Amino acid sequence: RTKRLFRHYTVGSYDSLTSHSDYVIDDKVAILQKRDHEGFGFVLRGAKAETPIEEFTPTPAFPALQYLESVDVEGVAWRAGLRTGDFLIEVNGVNVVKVGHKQVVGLIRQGGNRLVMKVVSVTR
Amino acid sequence: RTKRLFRHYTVGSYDSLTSHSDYVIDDKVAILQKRDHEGFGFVLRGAKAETPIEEFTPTPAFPALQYLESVDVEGVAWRAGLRTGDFLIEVNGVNVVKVGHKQVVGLIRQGGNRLVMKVVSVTR
């Protein structure tokens, strides 16, 4: 049950034993309601781009362009289940995987006190 | 000056832009002082071994056998700067990179209300 996969490589009487653990992709939905003065409690970080970057290709390690660079502990987002490193997938019914920072920020701001997001967590 | 490395890969006129970040290996010393009844506030996880596994080979991905599965927020370890996924290098000055789980836990309990841990945070 509780066990990790290790690779045992051996050549010419030398051994190495290394761990090669796959990325877990864990999707969640967050609903955030704030007060007029308070923040949602997160710092968003991602690529600057005027238009979506079509050729952008999600990988297990990097699903999307905009991610949470930090989350205020016991702030609105934290309470809603958001954690540092979550990748933004959808923001108020808009797909944002490939979307530049300014536009995502603009969507979040159009929402006012309410923000509803699909995000993804990744761990190894 | 804030930026991220991507790889632009093209062949046969098909294009793919993927994140291509260098591993950031951050070593830190955490010093934990708990009260008699509180815990250090973390769950340690890693390979069982009655003796050190000498043939273990550290990689950027997976530097050591024991790591932080979870850290309770607002707890002692959290406040000391420890986070989920850190790899234990030293415990109370003793190298634990290749040390079995039972023995590392032992070293920790031996310290009483004090715990000094050298850890590394791997991010990409």
Binding site: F42, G46 | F6
Partner: peptide, 15 residues
């Protein structure tokens, strides 16, 4: 065919 590394700039925004 080619493979090229590029730094794309990123922004931070507290919300």
């Amino acid at each position: 065919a080619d493979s090229i590394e590029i730094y794309i700039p990123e922004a931070q925004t507290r919300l």
